């Protein structure tokens, strides 16, 4: 899955 | 600043944990004043309204309970009477009075039924061989008022249907729909359904113009006269569910009263107590310990020491799983284990990740020191949103004031990510000016990142790595870092702070705790720390450490084990690095 910072 | 265990503890102390709870049910809309007062006005003035709030709030349940307590005048009898053999009208008589009209007709005094009786007059005048009132509804009190919740907003369910007796039809084949059943009371519908069924426009025409047409089949139709609509409509939906609708100027005209639920409530004894009563009303056998744990999970679901999540149906759903684990009983334990079991049920990806880390397939450091390297912290955007550390490298070379985000050039970094990098660059240029423009090119890479990454929360990690690469400053690999930074180098708040912290702790634990591992984070996020028991005890044991900072330089001092000043401090080494880079660049 795409990742947040 | 270092955050002690004492500063970090946020849990409610438990006294007499197994004691059964006994508390009265809170009133509907507790902790939701705005929504209740908006709804109150809507009732008082007869306005249409919409209830807006995120999913799982219990908006529907609160609504039906509130309307249960209401009182209206007993609803009129409601009927279709024919005005012709191809025409019918909607009519109200005072209540119970249709059966006298119906039976009088059943032969072959009611002022309201005039036009129907006039046209009720030439079988004898032509031997001419369908005419008796069709009762739709009637009730014996307006307490409680009519309350019709039609979740499935199709044309037939809203407006009733024509049946065809072979094909012929007449008045008596007309069935009512929700709109008819809600007369003199409340009709509740879901905004999403009105959209998905395509019935919004026909619903407007009923409200605006009184057009309520029974659904036909494409032989011959009765015309159906419009009538004055007597009902209060209440829409229910998420904020996003209402934006399709708000674009239509008709929506704000029709539904004037917004009743908006807060997604959270103040974390207070009065709401804890109200939560207990509500759980008892639901049928749970609740202990003081069980209530206290659910109230705290609600604070943790909110990511706020001082607020609790308002989604009563989420809390009830967790309570239901806890109850099964306590054999019918809602105890502290049952709740802790139910929370732990949800995590385990969704743990496969982290177990895979941790295995990969332990195998060296992903290369991560959690001890020692290294130049131009930091553990930053990311969140995997799939529920339940695990945090993980991500290794970030900065490399500095003599060049022409360039900061290269490799992940953004490769197209993995999003807009807010790009913005974070440009902000750092603005900081660095304006901060180090003695050589004119910066005499370095700096490249930043999230080392084994194969996926898209978005947000500003890597700002701090990137900037400190950049400074480290600039001054050749070894940084601790046993502290992970998270924070955004502004153009002045101050450290700003980030999201998902619990997941981020807990995710580094999980990799440190899997690689064996050193006793010096920790996280550096924004002081601004102190109110958001609602850390899980296991991290709290490790901090209490001196096995793990949290630092809160307000500036980037503060973070660099902790990481490089030194102060910016007291020269021999980090600032002169940074300046010394830049001087070296400038000389290689020019001479």
UniProtKB/TrEMBL annotation, chain B:
<dbReference type="Pfam" id="PF05362">
    <property type="entry name" value="Lon_C"/>
</dbReference>
<dbReference type="InterPro" id="IPR041699">
    <property type="entry name" value="AAA_32"/>
</dbReference>
<keyword id="KW-0378">Hydrolase</keyword>
<keyword id="KW-0645">Protease</keyword>
<dbReference type="InterPro" id="IPR008269">
    <property type="entry name" value="Lon_proteolytic"/>
</dbReference>
<dbReference type="Pfam" id="PF13654">
    <property type="entry name" value="AAA_32"/>
</dbReference>
<protein>
    <recommendedName>
        <fullName>endopeptidase La</fullName>
        <ecNumber>3.4.21.53</ecNumber>
    </recommendedName>
</protein>
<feature type="domain" description="Lon proteolytic">
    <location>
        <begin position="442"/>
        <end position="562"/>
    </location>
</feature>
<dbReference type="InterPro" id="IPR046843">
    <property type="entry name" value="LonB_AAA-LID"/>
</dbReference>
<dbReference type="Pfam" id="PF20436">
    <property type="entry name" value="LonB_AAA-LID"/>
</dbReference>
<dbReference type="InterPro" id="IPR027065">
    <property type="entry name" value="Lon_Prtase"/>
</dbReference>
<dbReference type="GO" id="GO:0004176">
    <property type="term" value="F:ATP-dependent peptidase activity"/>
</dbReference>
<comment type="similarity">
    <text>Belongs to the peptidase S16 family.</text>
</comment>
<dbReference type="InterPro" id="IPR027417">
    <property type="entry name" value="P-loop_NTPase"/>
</dbReference>
<feature type="active site">
    <location>
        <position position="500"/>
    </location>
</feature>
<keyword id="KW-0720">Serine protease</keyword>
<feature type="active site">
    <location>
        <position position="457"/>
    </location>
</feature>
<dbReference type="InterPro" id="IPR020568">
    <property type="entry name" value="Ribosomal_Su5_D2-typ_SF"/>
</dbReference>
<dbReference type="GO" id="GO:0006508">
    <property type="term" value="P:proteolysis"/>
</dbReference>
<dbReference type="GO" id="GO:0004252">
    <property type="term" value="F:serine-type endopeptidase activity"/>
</dbReference>
<dbReference type="InterPro" id="IPR014721">
    <property type="entry name" value="Ribsml_uS5_D2-typ_fold_subgr"/>
</dbReference>
<dbReference type="GO" id="GO:0005524">
    <property type="term" value="F:ATP binding"/>
</dbReference>
<dbReference type="GO" id="GO:0030163">
    <property type="term" value="P:protein catabolic process"/>
</dbReference>
